[PDB]
Amino acid sequence: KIVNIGAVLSTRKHEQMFREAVNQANKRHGSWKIQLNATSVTHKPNAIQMALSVCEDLISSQVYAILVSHPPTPNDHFTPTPVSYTAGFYRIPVLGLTTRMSIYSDKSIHLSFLRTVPPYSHQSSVWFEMMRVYSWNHIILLVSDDHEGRAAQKRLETLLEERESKAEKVLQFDPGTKNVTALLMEAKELEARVIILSASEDDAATVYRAAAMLNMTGSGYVWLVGEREISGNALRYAPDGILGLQLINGKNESAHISDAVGVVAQAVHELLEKENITDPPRGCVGNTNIWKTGPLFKRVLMSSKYADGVTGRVEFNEDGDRKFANYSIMNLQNRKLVQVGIYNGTHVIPNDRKIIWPGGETEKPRGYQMSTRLKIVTIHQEPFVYV
Amino acid sequence: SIGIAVILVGTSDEVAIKDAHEKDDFHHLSVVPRVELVAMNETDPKSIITRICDLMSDRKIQGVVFADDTDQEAIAQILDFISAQTLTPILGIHGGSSMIMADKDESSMFFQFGPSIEQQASVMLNIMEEYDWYIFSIVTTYFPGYQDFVNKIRSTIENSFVGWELEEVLLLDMSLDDGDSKIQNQLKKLQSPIILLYCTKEEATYIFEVANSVGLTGYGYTWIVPSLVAGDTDTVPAEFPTGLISVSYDEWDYGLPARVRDGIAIITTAASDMLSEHSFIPEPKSSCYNTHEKRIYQSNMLNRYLINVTFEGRNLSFSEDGYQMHPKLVIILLNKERKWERVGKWKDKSLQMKYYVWPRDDHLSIVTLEEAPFVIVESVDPLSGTCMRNTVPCQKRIGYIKKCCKGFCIDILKKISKSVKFTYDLYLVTNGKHGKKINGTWNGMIGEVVMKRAYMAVGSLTINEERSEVVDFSVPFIET
Amino acid sequence: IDLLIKLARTMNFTYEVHLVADGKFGTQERVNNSNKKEWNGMMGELLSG
Ligand SMILES: *[C@@H]1O[C@H](CO)[C@@H](O)[C@H](O)[C@H]1NC(C)=O
User: Fold this and answer.
1) Between helices B74-85 and A80-90, what is the axis angle to 10°?
2) What is the nearest CA distance from A187 to chain C, expressed in angstroms?
C-alpha cells in the first residue's frame, strides 16, 4: 500500500535524489502489503510558521519514520524540536540525521526519536583512552556552561573513575563572558600539562585569544579540542599544534539516507508477522487519542544491525545512538590540516606523519610537572615544636 | 492589557469559574485582568495551536490557566513548545500538565503545581525516621529520568548523625526483552524488612506479577512507591498486596475550583509590581504570526521577577526547573481491599502521623517497670529525634510520650529475640508496681498478663507460689 | 622541626612554615545544618589545598 513517508528536509536537491533512494530500497525489500512512498516538504529555517508547518502535511500522510536535515545557518538547534514534540505524543518514531546536540539523547523527553549520528558529547568516550596510551596521568578540564558541556563533563568523570583518577581540577566557564583571563591564569598554578576544551564557536575564539599573551602557545603544552573548535569561526586565533578530533562522512547528508532507509525498510519485514498492525488514524485534527501500538514499533528497530551502505556497520541501540563511531585524529600545523591518526571504533590507529606540538618540539612533553616548593603545617606542642 | 484565558478539557463545571473569574479583588494595583472562560475538546495538537492562535491575538493577552481532567502525560510536552516560541506565561493546575518534567528552554515561562522526584525522596525519609526503620532496600526500574531521586539518597546518608543501614541498591530492568524471568532471579536476594520500589502505573501490574510470585509481601514487608504509581485513589491496579503505603499529591482538600483560584490571582499580580517601580507594562508582540520578529521584545527580566509569590498566607516561589517547593503531601495506605486512606499531613516540613506504632503472633506486648540496676528510663534526645543506638524504643501510656528504656535486663531480651524470632512494643505499667492481690484482682505487670493484655512481662520479678499459680515463670537466671 | 631540615637536604625541598588557623588537630563533623559532615582544623586545612 502507498505509505507516504518522508521528512522536512532542507537542500531541495538532496531530497530530490532521495526520491530515488527509496526506489533502491523498493527493490531490496520483499514485502508486498506495503509500498512506501516519499512525500517530503521544504524546510522552514524560521519559527514563524512552525505553529502550522509540522504535522499539517506529515501526520495527515500517515508517516512512520521521519528524517531530518540542517538549515544553512550553522548555529541552529531549533530544527528538530517541533517535529519531535508531535511525534512524542503520538509515539511514532522519528529519525535524526543532522542532529548533533546532546539534548536529544537523554530520552526523558522525546520518547520516540532515533539518531543516526552520535551527539557531540559522545566524543568524550574516545577521548578517555586518548591520553592514556601516551601516559599523561594529569589533565585540566574546562568546559563552557552548556548542557552538551554538562554532559561531557558528567560522562568523562563517570568514565575516568575506573582509573581511580580524581580528574585533578575542574573549571567552569559561563558563555557570554569575555574578560576571563583572571579565571584562566588560575590553571597555571597546577602541575598538569594537558589542556582540553569543548566549547562553542564564540567561546573557542576568545579562549584562544587569551592563550596568546599568556604564552600558552609556548613549548611544554598539549591541547585537545573537539571537532567544533577546529572548524568554523575559531581558526582566526587558533594556536598551533592542536590535536583536535574530526568527524568523517558525518556531513555527507547525500549518503545519510543510504544507511537511513535500509534499517527502516527492512524493519517492517520482521513486523509483518504479528498482530495489531494498524496504521495510526488519518490527519492531525480528527485523531485525539494515541493508538495502542506505540513504542512497540521501535522494539524491532535496535534489533536491526545491517552492515551495508556508504558507511555501513550501523548498530543503533541502547540510547538510540550509533555504536562504534568513526573519527579521524587531526593535527593542525602552520595553518594547515594534516591527518595523523584514525579511530576505527575500538583502538587508536595513528599515521606515519610526524605529530607536532606547539613550539616546534618533536618530543611529547609529559602531562605532569613537579613543584620544589612546599608549604608545611605545624601546631604548637611543648616537647616537639616550641613557639 | 492582561488577559487570563482558561482552558478546560473534559467533564467539569466551568460555570462557577466565571464567578471565580469575577473574584480578583486586586483593585490596589493595575491588574486589569480580562479573564476568559474557554472550554472545548481540543486534545489534538492542531486544534490547540489554532485555537490559541485566534485567542492570544485578540488583545495583549499574557496569561493562560490550564485545567484538565485527563491523565494524558503527553499534553504538557506540547505546551512547552508554545511557551518557548511565545512569551506568555502559562500555568496548569490539573490534568495533562501537572506532572514532572526534566528541563526546558530559558524562554519557557511555564510552571505547575506538583513536586518532582527529588522532592519525593526527602518526603518518605522523614516519616520513616519516626518509626526508626534503619534497614531498607532501594529498588527501581529503568525509566527516562530514573536517576535523580536515587542520587539524593546518597547525599543525605553520608552527612547524617544517625547511622543508616543501606541494604544495597537494586537496578533491575523491567522493559528489557527476555528479562521478565530475571525479575524473579533478582527477587531472591532481599532480606531488609523495608524495601523502596519505583515503577510505573501501567507496568505496576506487570512488575507485581513477579513480585507476588516470590510472595515476600504478606505481612512482614512494606512497599514504598511514589505518587505517580498510584495516580488516583479510585483508580487501583487491584494487584497491589494489602498493606501498601505511599505518598500522594493532595486532591481531596484541593478542589478544581479551589486550585483554579490560586493560579488566576498569582498570574495577574505577578507583573503588578513591575508597573510599580519601572513604570512599564511588558507587552511583547501579541501576534500569532511572525513569531520570529517578536524575539526583540525579551521578557527574561520579567521571568526572574516571578520568584517572589505570596498569597493567602503561603508563599509559592518557583525555581528554574518549574517546581513549587511547597507541596501538600498526603500519605495513602492500602486497606484490606483496594482503597487508599489518608495517613498523615505535611505543613512546612512538618509531619504528623495519626497512630503511634505500626499495627499488625510474632509481635508480643511487653510490660516493664523502671528499677535502678536492671531497667532505667529517660526522656528522648531532642537533637536527633531518637534516643541513641543500643537504646531500645519505649512507649509510655499518657495519650503517649516517646520515652526510652535502657539497662541490663532489657539487654537479655535482645539476645533471645534473635534466638527465637519475635517482635515487641515495650510499654510501662500504669496502675501499681510489681503487682498486689486486692479484692481478688492483680495489678502491675502481673496484672496485665492475668487480664490478657501483655502476654509477656519482664524486669525484676520474684518467683513465689501465689504468682506461680497464675502465670508460668521460666527458669531463673539471677539469685535473690 | 629538626627532622624537617634533615629531609629537606636529602631530596631537594624548599619549605615555608605556617601554623594552623584555629588550634584543633582535626575531626569530621557537621556544622549549622546537621548535614555538612566535614573536617576541621589542621586536618581540614590539608584537604583544602
Ligand atoms: C638539588 O638540585 C641541585 C641543582 O638544582 C643539584 O645539586 C641536585 O640536582 C640536587 N641536590 C642533591 C640531590 O643533593
Assistant:
1) 160
2) 14
